[PDB]
Design a protein around this ligand. Structure first.
Ligand SMILES: Nc1ncnc2c1ncn2[C@@H]1O[C@H](COP(=O)(O)OP(=O)(O)NP(=O)(O)O)[C@@H](O)[C@H]1O
Ligand SMILES: Nc1ncnc2c1ncn2[C@@H]1O[C@H](COP(=O)(O)OP(=O)(O)NP(=O)(O)O)[C@@H](O)[C@H]1O
Ligand SMILES: Nc1ncnc2c1ncn2[C@@H]1O[C@H](COP(=O)(O)OP(=O)(O)O)[C@@H](O)[C@H]1O
Ligand SMILES: [Mg+2]
Ligand SMILES: [Mg+2]
Ligand SMILES: [Mg+2]
Lengths: 467, 167, 510, 484
């Protein structure tokens, strides 16, 4: 029915209802705004009152203002006419192109794909990024996570991912920027119109955009990700299609949840996250999945607060992944972009009975030698290098080569690197390392592997640096 | 479950919560007025030199304080469906509170009737009308018949201002 | 705040008028408020502590706070289906779960319901998830082996039946595999003819994603292990009290086999995630936060549960429940609140480490930190007469590891221990999903622990053991199968071994 | 028109009345004091007083304004010094404030914008080569106290003389400078510094300091933003510097705690992120269809013992488009301005330089993060192959280059001059202990001789094989004339 605001703090408005107490989750309508204001219901304090989160700023509201029970959960422009279009938290379009035109709408608060719908098929999605493919390949239609502290190359990676993986793809992609930089959305729109995965003219757009950046309220950010996945959940269940869902940054979801949690009546828990950080994540990751009906390759990027991979946010995220690429500040700081930690990155399909004994045996061999080099690391740098074995100056030599050959000039990073982009096919990666490992280049100097593509392009820099 | 007669005075939010009850408990049997006066009386059945040895006494408790309030109800001019707002405050340990619960009973009664705006210098305009500042003039006619930065701030300072004609 | 629930308007009004909904709120009540999975309720003036109630909208709930003026109820499910007012009703409900053999092969949820989509469970019996554990006297000292079939474990960290050994380690180190392979290995006993040696497996998944528990059961099915395994699963998007509960259900379904002279193994993967859930309920219930914000009963929680695995003396069936709880540690901190607690409750730890993992040590068991307080007693004699030595030798190898590097020229006496050490170490490496039989193990360890492998390049060892194992398994199924049933290594079997080892190596490296 | 005061203390007035007051709407007080609504609760409005709450007493009168909070705007502010509400405080009588913008403005969404392409020069070799800012960028200055965090933002405004005293209407940059939390003794000494070097003219300076009330520091950097929003929304170029957000946050914390909003990490309130996020988004590079106008923002953060895990410093870094780190260690070591190249990033890269700089320093940022690590590996006196003998034989000299004086920016042209000297290897054979008496000459020698070459590179902003050729001798014409 109709309801009247009783109280308002920051982002949490309580409302009172004569008769029609809206069920939790039910989207409510603020009457009297120069721009639409929705209030996702959050609890029944009782006496016909309901506490709620605002999907925009409450600047202006007034005790008694008119609120209307929209009768059901936030609903969005799910459907095929979302491609090329920048949606938002509540459906409303914001590329300025007048209503998104569809007669199919779905609530963003769904249940989750039951046990029996689970698909157990996993096959290697090659990305052409050497480090990921060699040591921790992603899997077609699986949950992938990009771990990173601030500034280590999380976002750039996901670009070079949407560039590679999502271009040579004839299905549908849904990129949803939750809680990060507005500059970076505008930035992608135009790259994605230069490439024309978004085409303003025809209807050949292969990419739905949902957006709710670090400039919006906690209400928004807390739900922007619920929207962008409702969008990609359609393209899955219907088409049976191969939906690529990118998020950046799934962290801002729990942070956003944090900001209001206080004002919602929660004794805080460890590190001061919501007492619900756990399940909030669960009933929401458990939706970004692959059913028998369809498949969603998911590439989330997770902020690691202060790089502490144990911070209850990134920590709890790990359970929900099938392949995790973890980014290292110490690696980046050495100039080795993409700063992937070849010893904290993991895939479920790194099984010799899935990738073959050549692949596997070769990855693990690289992983090993890098680990061994890490071990000699505080002998040598404080107690004389040449005091090493013969065996060891050798496993150092090769290691540092291997370690650098693992870098890649990214195509979306030419602006930084200075070298033209690159991209290596899985089998030339396996081969490249297998060689270095085998002792076939112990003669070429270090820098020759730094930032080249296929292994030969290092033999190139091998003379270019020579004479 | 039951729906509630929230009369557009509302009042509280946390404590005089019993009050907000009986504008809805009363408005079924339209006995609003039967109590508007009933309470006025109990407000002093307790301010006696004979009722304060329990009024603020955690000594007797919810035993002989509720069934010794079957007296100051049944006996006197009460014993209706309002001998109970006591029998509640009796049990729910808030007899020490009723004065405030009656106070608000009023300020919610005289907003179905009167209006409360007040004059400047003396008593209540009780503008019991369908329109605010309509009868604000025609009822105060029975009242006759019974510039340099600083000087700026110092002129509004006497107009509608200060400690002067206030006394 | 000052006031108090129940006490206001909605409720208040009607204590004046005269309200008469038959059930004086004894058998029912109504929702005073609801959010974050907590449902405060008026009435139920007759509910018991921890009783199960039914919501108007059909949902299930549990009565954890019986406060004076209201019952605080935690909601088994999404709560959009609850609103202020809904009537709540005592169902006379006992929180119990389906029990007995009719579960093997099934995948139930936290409460016992099939979710494998294979319809009804023919549960002939029910047992309450909330039960005291066998006291002091019903028990006898753990002695029968519970063999995981993992070389590192069965030799250096023996688990017996009735024991609670903890798989503990940072994330992504093989904690769950240790559990899996253990289940798998159980089959060889279950398809034999010895009842005394069969083992039924409950594996409780708490807090994990479905794409995982699924994957998991596919693997347990491909091994044909599902046939003797119950898989209880309260996944990530299940509500809290489910996860909180799941392990006690699991315990109850194995506690059945225990009390019917049979032998069960339960895995609680992951006992850290259950804690989290219980924490959540405790916090929203507004119960005093303590360290890491966990309640004062998050010890009491796990110690109630894990003290329920035991070895019943003969007079009680002879049965056994054995628990492998699994704790995720953060940056290896085993002094954190939950690790501390569990490590405290259990009687052993198998710690797994990431550096070990990548160095090559897979399984990545740190044999120095790992321990089993049951120890030797849980081991067959054969195993005991090689494992002993190995332990000691690796221990010395450990004391002198430093000189690996800055020691390519040192007392030929300790040049020795290094060699033996790295070799013994290679022997403890093992592939995934490939659990070995105890007599097989004793053989391959015997080889190294007695010298015979000392003059072989470490590299080749995992290949030698691979072929050597095979040779005896097809050929001398003779006095291999005899090492097993006899239990020990006979004066005679010692020799038939030295003959096969030395002469086979001979020809191997030739 | 408005009502009572329920209770007052600590800058927090509870009010029983105001029944139709907007949340976030500013009220006014009996004594003529502007307050503010922030807690709209059932039975009262908690109001954050914008000044000394001694004058307030129980019972006073609070009256609505109807307005959400706003401030003076426009060129009528330049050269002035205003408190957090716009009021002038340099004793020069009111500003000509016809323009009046709201503080509580949300930031430009996706469309109104365009990739940051416009070089915002600092005149600091260090910054303009290795972490270059551009108009619309947020680049954070972070560091321990007394590391040089301010002599960055000051040296930069003092650089904008050159452009603001000329013709080219794009190269012009008007400067706002919020001063949150500091002491007046300093705000002043700083204006005096601006004034002297003659830059004060193009520069608002909003100042909410130590003694100013709490909500006044809360608000200050927002106010100073609106003032810079105008300059962009009307086709011009603004550079606002919040100094510092650390002190602001602290202030917001106070309000929040006194308002009884349950405390979080380090006592701060939940939205303490939202606070800096939203403010800092409001700096953008507007797209042509909207003015072409910009708002570059240098927020400033102060760390404890270097701890960048501190709630705040980690938040603000996650927000800005990169940052400069400071480090006392380098400072005393001689590396003034103390920067830490390897740890400073500019998330806009060369996309914000002239193609003149880019050519002398576009892959030298990933070189002084490897020459770094490759002199920390072979620190000790041994032997290293033919490849890594040189990288060191260079760098030591190169660093002596970004060593720069204070209050003495450089125009991009000259920066390209010296950077060229080394990067092309015309210093690869000189004892570092001289590489300063050198530059201090070779740059006053090629301003007195060739205003020629500078002319070109300065204008077309590039080094054609033409320009390059001339250089290739002007240089050489110097090393041989000193040592050889
Ligand atoms: N004995 C082994 N040899 C080689 N690889 C192994 C071995 N055991 C496990 N792995 C690999 O290690 C990976 C993950 O180990 P896992 O059993 O999941 O431990 P975990 O502690 O449960 N990690 P997680 O459940 O995500 O916190 C898998 O992909 C395996 O294939
Ligand atoms: N490039 C430079 N060369 C030599 N001295 C410098 C240089 N830059 C700054 N200084 C000096 O170092 C001091 C600190 O500079 P400042 O800008 O106040 O850093 P800060 O961290 O902002 N100090 P504070 O506001 O207390 O935090 C000054 O008093 C300067 O004169
Ligand atoms: N592929 C890359 N090659 C070289 N440098 C990179 C690469 N990716 C990121 N970087 C460096 O890291 C910085 C930050 O990248 P970003 O992905 O935005 O961090 P975040 O992980 O917080 O989103 C860049 O601006 C850049 O200088
Ligand atoms: Mg990013
Ligand atoms: Mg696991
Ligand atoms: Mg400063």
């Amino acid at each position: 029915t109709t309801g009247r605001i009783v109280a308002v703090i920051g982002a949490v408005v309580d409302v009172q209802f004569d008769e029609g107490l809206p069920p939790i989750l039910n989207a409510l309508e603020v009457q009297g705004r120069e721009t639409r204001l929705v209030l996702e219901v959050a609890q029944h304090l009782g006496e016909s009152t309901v506490r709620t989160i605002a999907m925009d700023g409450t600047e202006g509201l007034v005790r008694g203002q008119k609120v209307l029970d929209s009768g059901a959960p936030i609903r969005i422009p799910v459907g095929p006419e979302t491609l090329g279009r920048i949606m938002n938290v509540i459906g409303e379009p914001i590329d300025e192109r007048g209503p998104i035109k569809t007669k199919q709408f779905a609530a963003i608060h769904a249940e989750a794909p039951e046990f029996v719908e689970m698909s157990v098929e996993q096959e290697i999605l090659v990305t052409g990024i050497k480090v990921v493919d060699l040591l921790a390949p992603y899997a077609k239609g699986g949950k992938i996570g990009l771990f990173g502290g601030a500034g280590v190359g999380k976002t750039v990676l996901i670009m070079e991912l949407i560039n590679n993986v999502a271009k040579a793809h004839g299905g549908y992609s849904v990129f949803a920027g939750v809680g990060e930089r507005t500059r970076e959305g505008n930035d992608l729109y135009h790259e994605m119109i230069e490439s024309g995965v978004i085409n303003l003219k025809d209807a050949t757009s292969k990419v739905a955009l949902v957006y709710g950046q670090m400039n919006e309220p906690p209400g928004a950010r807390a739900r922007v990700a619920l929207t962008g996945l409702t969008v990609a959940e359609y393209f899955r269940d219907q088409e049976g299609q191969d939906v690529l869902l990118f998020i950046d940054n799934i962290f801002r979801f729990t942070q956003a949840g944090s900001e209001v949690s206080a004002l919602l009546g929660r004794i805080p828990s460890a590190v001061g996250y919501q007492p619900t950080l756990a399940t909030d994540m669960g009933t929401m990751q458990e939706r970004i999945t692959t059913t028998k009906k369809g498949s969603i390759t998911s590439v989330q990027a997770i902020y690691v607060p202060a790089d502490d991979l144990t911070d209850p946010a990134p920590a709890t995220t790990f359970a929900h992944l099938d392949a995790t690429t973890v980014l290292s500040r110490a690696i980046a700081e050495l100039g080795i972009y993409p700063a992937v930690d070849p010893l904290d990155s993991t895939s479920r399909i790194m099984d010799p009975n899935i990738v073959g004994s050549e692949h596997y045996d070769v990855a693990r061999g690289v992983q090993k030698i890098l680990q061994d080099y890490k071990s000699l690391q505080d002998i040598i740098a404080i107690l004389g290098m040449d005091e090493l074995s013969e065996e060891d100056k050798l496993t150092v030599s090769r290691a540092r080569k291997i370690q650098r050959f693992l870098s890649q000039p990214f195509q979306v990073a030419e602006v930084f690197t200075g070298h033209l982009g690159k991209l290596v096919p899985l089998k030339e990666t396996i081969k490249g390392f297998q060689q270095i490992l085998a002792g076939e280049y112990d003669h070429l100097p270090e820098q020759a592997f730094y930032m080249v593509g296929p292994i030969e392009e290092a033999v190139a820099k091998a003379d270019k640096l020579a004479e | 479950f039951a729906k509630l007669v929230r009369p557009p005075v509302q009042i509280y939010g946390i404590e005089g919560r019993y009050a907000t009850a009986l504008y809805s408990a009363a408005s079924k049997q339209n006995k609003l007025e039967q109590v508007e006066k009933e309470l006025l009386r109990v407000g002093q059945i307790l301010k006696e030199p004979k009722m304060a040895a329990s009024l603020l006494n955690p000594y007797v408790k919810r035993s002989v304080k509720v069934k010794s309030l079957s007296d100051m109800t049944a006996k006197e001019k009460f014993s209706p469906l309002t001998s109970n707002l006591i029998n509640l405050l009796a049990e729910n340990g808030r007899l020490t509170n009723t004065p405030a619960v009656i106070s608000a009973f009023s300020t919610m009664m005289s907003v179905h009737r009167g209006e409360v705006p007040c004059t400047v210098t003396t008593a209540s305009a009780l503008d019991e009308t369908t329109l605010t500042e309509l009868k604000t003039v025609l009822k105060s006619f029975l009242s006759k018949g019974q510039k340099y930065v600083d000087m700026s701030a110092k002129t509004k300072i006497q107009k509608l201002s200060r400690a002067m004609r206030e006394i | 705040q000052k006031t108090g629930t129940a006490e206001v308007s909605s409720i208040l009004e009607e204590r004046i008028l005269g309200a008469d909904t038959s059930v004086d709120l004894e058998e029912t009540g109504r929702v005073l408020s609801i959010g974050d999975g907590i449902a405060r309720v008026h009435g139920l003036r007759n509910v018991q502590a921890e009783e199960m109630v039914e919501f108007s909208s059909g949902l299930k709930g549990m009565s954890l706070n019986l406060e004076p003026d209201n019952v605080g109820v935690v909601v088994f499910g999404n709560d959009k289906l609850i609103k202020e007012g809904d009537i709540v009703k005592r169902t006379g409900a006992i929180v119990d779960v389906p029990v007995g053999e009719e579960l093997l092969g099934r995948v139930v949820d936290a409460l016992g319901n099939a979710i494998d989509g294979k319809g009804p469970i023919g549960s002939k019996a029910r047992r309450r998830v909330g039960l005291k554990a066998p006291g002091i006297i019903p028990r006898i000292s753990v002695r029968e082996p519970m063999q995981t079939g993992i070389k590192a474990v069965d030799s250096l960290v023996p688990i017996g039946r009735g024991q609670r050994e903890l798989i503990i380690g940072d994330r992504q180190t093989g904690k769950t595999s240790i559990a899996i392979d253990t289940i798998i290995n159980q089959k060889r006993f279950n398809d034999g003819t010895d009842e005394k040696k069969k083992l039924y497996c409950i594996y409780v998944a708490i807090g994990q994603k479905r794409s995982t528990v699924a994957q998991l059961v596919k693997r347990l099915t491909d091994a044909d292990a599902m046939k003797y395994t119950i898989v209880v699963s309260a996944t990530a998007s299940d509500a809290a009290p489910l996860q909180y509960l799941a392990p006690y259900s699991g315990c109850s379904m194995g506690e059945y086999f225990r009390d019917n002279g049979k032998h069960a193994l339960i895995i609680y993967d992951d006992l850290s995630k259950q804690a989290v859930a219980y924490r959540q309920m405790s916090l929203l219930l507004r119960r005093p936060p303590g360290r890491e914000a966990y309640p004062g009963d998050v010890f009491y929680l796990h110690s109630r549960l894990l003290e329920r695995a035991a070895k019943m003396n003969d007079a009680f069936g002879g049965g056994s429940l054995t628990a492998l709880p699994v704790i995720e540690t953060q940056a290896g901190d085993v002094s954190a609140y939950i690790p501390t607690n569990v490590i405290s409750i259990t009687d052993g730890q198998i710690f797994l480490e990431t550096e070990l993992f990548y160095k090559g040590i897979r399984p990545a068991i740190n044999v120095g930190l790992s321990v089993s307080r049951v120890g030797s007693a849980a081991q067959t004699r054969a195993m005991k007469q090689v494992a002993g030595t190995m332990k000691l030798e690796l221990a010395q190898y450990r004391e002198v590891a430093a000189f690996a590097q800055f020691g390519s020229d040192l007392d030929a006496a300790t040049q020795q221990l290094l060699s033996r050490g790295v070799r013994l170490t290679e022997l403890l490496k093992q592939g995934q999903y490939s659990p070995m039989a105890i007599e097989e193990q004793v053989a391959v360890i015997y080889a190294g622990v007695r010298g015979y492998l000392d003059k072989l390049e470490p590299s080749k060892i995992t290949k030698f053991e691979n072929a050597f194992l095979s040779h005896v398994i097809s050929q001398h199924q003779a006095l291999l199968g005899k090492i097993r049933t006899d239990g020990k290594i006979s004066e005679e079997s010692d020799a038939k071994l030295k003959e096969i080892v030395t002469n086979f190596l001979a020809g191997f490296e030739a």
